[PDB]
Amino acid sequence: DFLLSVIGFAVDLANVWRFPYLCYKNGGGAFLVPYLLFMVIAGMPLFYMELALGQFNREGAAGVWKICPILKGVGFTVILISLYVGFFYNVIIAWALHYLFSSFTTELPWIHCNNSWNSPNCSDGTTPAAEYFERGVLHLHQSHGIDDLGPPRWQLTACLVLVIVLLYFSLWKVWITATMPYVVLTALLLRGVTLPGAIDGIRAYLSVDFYRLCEASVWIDAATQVCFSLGVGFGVLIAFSSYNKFTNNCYRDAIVTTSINSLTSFSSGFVVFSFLGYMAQKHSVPIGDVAKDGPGLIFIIYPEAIATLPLSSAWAVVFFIMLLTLGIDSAMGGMESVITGLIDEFQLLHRHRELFTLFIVLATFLLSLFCVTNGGIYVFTLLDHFAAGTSILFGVLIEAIGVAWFYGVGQFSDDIQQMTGQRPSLYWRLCWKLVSPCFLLFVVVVSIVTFRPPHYGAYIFPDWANALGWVIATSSMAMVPIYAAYKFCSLPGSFREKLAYAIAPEKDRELVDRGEVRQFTLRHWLKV
Ligand SMILES: NCCc1ccc(O)c(O)c1
Numbered sequence: 129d130f131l132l133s134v135i136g137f138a139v140d141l142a143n144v145w146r147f148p149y150l151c152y153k154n155g156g157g158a159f160l161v162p163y164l165l166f167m168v169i170a171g172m173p174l175f176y177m178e179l180a181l182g183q184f185n186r187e188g189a190a191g192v193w194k195i196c197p198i199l200k201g202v203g204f205t206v207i208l209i210s211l212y213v214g215f216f217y218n219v220i221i222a223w224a225l226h227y228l229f230s231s232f233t234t235e236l237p238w239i240h241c242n243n244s245w246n247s248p249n250c251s252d253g254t255t256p257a258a259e260y261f262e263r264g265v266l267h268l269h270q271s272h273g274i275d276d277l278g279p280p281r282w283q284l285t286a287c288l289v290l291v292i293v294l295l296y297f298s299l300w301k302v303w304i305t306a307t308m309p310y311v312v313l314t315a316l317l318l319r320g321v322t323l324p325g326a327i328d329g330i331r332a333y334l335s336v337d338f339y340r341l342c343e344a345s346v347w348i349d350a351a352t353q354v355c356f357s358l359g360v361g362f363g364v365l366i367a368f369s370s371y372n373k374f375t376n377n378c379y380r381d382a383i384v385t386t387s388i389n390s391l392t393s394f395s396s397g398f399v400v401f402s403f404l405g406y407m408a409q410k411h412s413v414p415i416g417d418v419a420k421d422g423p424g425l426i427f428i429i430y431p432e433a434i435a436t437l438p439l440s441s442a443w444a445v446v447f448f449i450m451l452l453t454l455g456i457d458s459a460m461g462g463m464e465s466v467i468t469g470l471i472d473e474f475q476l477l478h479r480h481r482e483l484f485t486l487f488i489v490l491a492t493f494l495l496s497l498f499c500v501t502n503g504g505i506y507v508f509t510l511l512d513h514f515a516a517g518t519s520i521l522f523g524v525l526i527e528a529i530g531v532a533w534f535y536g537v538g539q540f541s542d543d544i545q546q547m548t549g550q551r552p553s554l555y556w557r558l559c560w561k562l563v564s565p566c567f568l569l570f571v572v573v574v575s576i577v578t579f580r581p582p583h584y585g586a587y588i589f590p591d592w593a594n595a596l597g598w599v600i601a602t603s604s605m606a607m608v609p610i611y612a613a614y615k616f617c618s619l620p621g622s623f624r625e626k627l628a629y630a631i632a633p634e635k636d637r638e639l640v641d642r643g644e645v646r647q648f649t650l651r652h653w654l655k656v
Pocket residue numbers: 140142209210211212213214215217218356357359362458459460462463
């Protein structure tokens with residue numbers, strides 16, 4: 129089935145690991161409003177556009193730009209973004225595998241403070257779960273900062289090797305993941321709702337304060353989260369649709385995938401806040417002082433409020449199995465996109481697919497070895513801030529501007545009506561033409577203007593770390609102007625001739641040679 133592949137990749141660890149984190153950081157309802165607004169405004173139109181554009185041209189993440197030859201660097205931008213994201217996406221899978229391996233006993237290791245990895249400041253005041261996660265799994269206490277990393281730990285490197293071997297051996301030439309995560313999530317939700325004290329947690333979840341909406345950070349977080357979770361801006365949807373039947377309904381597929389993604393995120397947040405409220409009632413603390421903010425919320429809160437219920441081992445086992453299955457598919461899809469795009473762009477290493485895949489896998493493993501050191505959480509934070517960031521928004525904005533303005537939203541609608549029996553309505557055309565590009569441009573400009581450098585707890589990153597992060601972002605962002613300059617210089621003729629052959633699709637060549645260019649008039653740009 130084609131739908132099960134799109135659903136499997138779209139729903140990932142971002143629905144269950146990042147959404148509750150950003151909800152707890154920005155309060156209950158101050159994050160749900162911009163998220164839903166940006167979702168309806170841009171996420172669904174971009175998903176539909178990506179599916180249709182991939183299905184029609186049938187060339188891949190970079191070969192679809194025969195409709196605009198000069199804007200072809202955005203095809204390499206998405207490949208670079210996927211490669212960067214893969215450098216830290218697999219470490220979470222390694223952590224989940226480690227927890228699953230260590231959660232097969234009658235005495236869970238995060239129960240009390242009578243172990244060798246504890247400190248005299250254990251609550252049982254720091255809770256034993258956070259102390260375990262930070263001193264027996266990560267060994268964070270043996271590092272001073274990002275300038276003192278230390279050698280890699282051999283315990284997490286084995287899990288990294290296992291994940292890498294699985295990926296390579298499944299990518300050298302879905303049905304299980306279709307149902308199990310949803311069953312586990314529903315069981316967890318049913319268990320969490322009935323726990324005493326969860327009503328206050330859901331009350332905090334469904335309450336919005338109108339002072340955080342006036343700051344230009346919740347909107348950036350919501351836009352970035354929507355783009356990251358949906359999967360737009362990686363080049364995966366284009367490649368997926370390039371292999372699909374011509375007479376296929378991408379409208380229905382986009383609607384269903386978006387609805388499922390939103391429902392999954394909402395359920396994950398509801399469960400997390402119910403557990404937080406239960407823990408807060410169990411102890412004597414406010415909800416906002418239960419755990420510190422960071423990308424360890426689901427590794428600290430879940431074991432803590434799972435170790436109190438009867439049959440905790442089974443709950444832990446199913447939780448970590450669901451975590452593994454929900455992420456292996458997306459980790460596979462990203463590398464599939466990178467490899468297939470790079471092998472279809474350059475038809476010299478085509479039959480040499482085995483060696484190219486081996487090289488890509490080796491590079492991913494070697495460069496992800498940086499996050500398994502003693503101070504690897506700082507590298508993880510830096511990558512999580514600077515890999516998708518404003519680069520993904522810039523790429524999405526460039527793709528939308530290309531497809532709409534430089535090609536014709538009317539021409540796009542005519543192509544869709546040829547591929548199907550219907551013409552997209554005025555809502556979709558208006559969104560694509562005006563609504564998504566304007567909001568994306570505003571968000572990109574605001575994100576550049578306001579920096580807010582990353583941090584972990586009470587640790588402040590130095591200057592060179594921020595410089596390196598900005599270099600990482602600019603490396604993927606700067607693929608468009610370089611290829612534009614190369615393409616303009618490579619073409620022969622005069623400036624007018626070069627522009628005519630650079631901004632026109634590679635199908636109106638006879639019309640251009642006759643001297644008639646549609647892009648050189650005003651009705652082309654004033655058409656909605
Ligand atoms: N939801 C993001 C899924 C994703 C995207 C790119 C990657 O390289 C990867 O490993 C995972």
